[PDB]
Amino acid sequence: SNKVVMDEGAVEDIEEFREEVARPDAVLVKKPGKQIELNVDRELAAAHM
Amino acid sequence: PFRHNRFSLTPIWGFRRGRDNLPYGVIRWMRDIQDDINKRASKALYILS
After folding, report:
1. In chain A, whose CA is at the least distance from the CA of B48?
2. I want to staple A34 with a disulfide (CB 3.0 to 4.6 A). Which of A2, A10, B19, B46 is the partner?
């Protein structure tokens, strides 16, 4: 699963964003001036392994 | 009643403290380093979590 930290207006539809982020085939639309940071923490998985 | 003039109980000695002549086991140093190890484990696991 992805963790998402973003500007408050990154995505118009937050529900579909919430559902489709983990999807490897999803098409995501974001507003121009609002940044998206998917995969906030992934070195944690290697640390736990 | 026994002919031998000593108590029945024979103490199998171990490490004996020099100051107080008080016996102590092998553990003590292993004990302190072990508690330190446990603290390190808890701290690192919390930091990762």
Report:
1. A44
2. A10
